[PDB]
Design a binder for this molecule. Sequence first.
Ligand code: ADP
Ligand code: C5P
Ligand code: ALF
Ligand code: MG
Length: 194
Amino acid sequence: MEKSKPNVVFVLGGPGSGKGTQCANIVRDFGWVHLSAGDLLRQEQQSGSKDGEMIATMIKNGEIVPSIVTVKLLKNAIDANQGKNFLVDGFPRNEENNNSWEENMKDFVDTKFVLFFDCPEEVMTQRLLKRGESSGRSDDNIESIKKRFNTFNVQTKLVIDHYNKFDKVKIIPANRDVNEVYNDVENLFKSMGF
Ligand SMILES: Nc1ncnc2c1ncn2[C@@H]1O[C@H](COP(=O)(O)OP(=O)(O)O)[C@@H](O)[C@H]1O
Ligand SMILES: Nc1ccn([C@@H]2O[C@H](COP(=O)(O)O)[C@@H](O)[C@H]2O)c(=O)n1
Ligand code: ALF
Ligand SMILES: [Mg+2]
C-alpha cells in the first residue's frame, strides 16, 4: 500500500547471443519493460548531445561507455515507469557499470538475478554479420565484432562470475532455435513467480 520498488533482471550474454530477441518475448508475455542499454545509448547519440560522438566512437570500437551516461539513461527510464518491472539488457558489462548501479539504484530496486544466454562465439559472429545486412548498426562488422568479443571476455565475464558467486545467475543455452530458447525463458520466469 506503500508502492513496491521494481524487480530488475539483468540480461547478459555475448554480442548477438539473443538478449534483445528474448527480451521482446518476455515483454509480450509478462509485461515487463525492456531497457536495452545499447539501444538507450544509440538513442542518446542520435539526438544530439554532449556525449553523442563519444558514444559513437566507443560503440564502433566495442568499448564500454562511462557509467554516468549509461546509468543516468537507465535511471530516467525506470523513474518514468512507476509500478513496472524491468529487463535491464546488456548491463552491467563491467565492474564500473555494476558499482555505478549499486551506488545509484540499490535502495530503489530489487535486482533479482542475472539471466545469462550462453552462446559460442562462432555462432554469435554469424548472427551479427547477418544482422548487419539490415541493422544499420556501426558495430555489426567483422572489425567491431571481434573487439566486442574481447570486451565481453575481459570485462563482462568477471561481472557474471561475481554474481554467480552469490548464486544469482540463471544460465540458458542459446545455441538453438529461438522458440526452443524462449520455451526455457518463459518456464524460468513462471518458476520465479513472474
Ligand atoms: N536463437 C537464435 N537463433 C538464430 N538467430 C537468432 C537467435 N536469437 C536471435 N537471433 C538473431 O541474432 C541476431 C542478434 O540477436 P539480438 O537479440 O539482437 O542480440 P543481442 O544479444 O546483441 O541483443 C538478430 O539478428 C536475431 O534475430
Ligand atoms: N552497458 C553497456 C551496454 C552497451 N554499451 C555499448 O553499446 C554497444 C552495443 O551494445 P548492445 O549490443 O547491447 O546494443 C556495446 O558494444 C558498447 O559499445 C555500453 O558501452 N555499455
Ligand atoms: F547486445 Al548486442 F549486439 F545488441 F550484443
Ligand atoms: Mg541487443
